[PDB]
Amino acid sequence: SEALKILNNIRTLRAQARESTLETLEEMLEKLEVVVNERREEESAAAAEVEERTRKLQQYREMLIADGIDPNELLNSMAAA
Template structure:
């Protein structure tokens, strides 16, 4: 437990408070009283706001439950419902036939459909040897 919390717990004892109050001037006690009241008022306001937000949230939930019941649905229906995802509706792309062939740096013959990035081997041949893309047609 932190020291400040121990200190505040000791302030909860009326005898301790009276002993401290006897040693302090009345002006200091009044200043402490005013500051403490300010802190309590702020805390009370925070609690009221939190309670109001919780109440508003509960009212919204009740409103939607009523709407669901009006449509003949329950919360269980929503929880167990299987909602189709967007990925299930996608049409699978057909594989395109190869249009070009080339030899990679390992000497293997590879093919390319003409879609996507140009393979490095074709790009180098076009830049360094002056070949054209048509030279790689199948």
């Protein structure tokens, strides 16, 4: 990328910044800023969606062994019926 290239670098920015009135920058930040969250969303969203799943395993791992249940055999018991 050619744009992002520069928007990662302060001194380079400050420069290309002098170019435009606050009005722009300020407004156009707001813009960036949302995009960001827009991601911070998907990210934090699929975070729960996942971990949550595997937490179930821990508990099942437990509730199976807690009801004594052996792993292998029993899994099939519910895999064929």
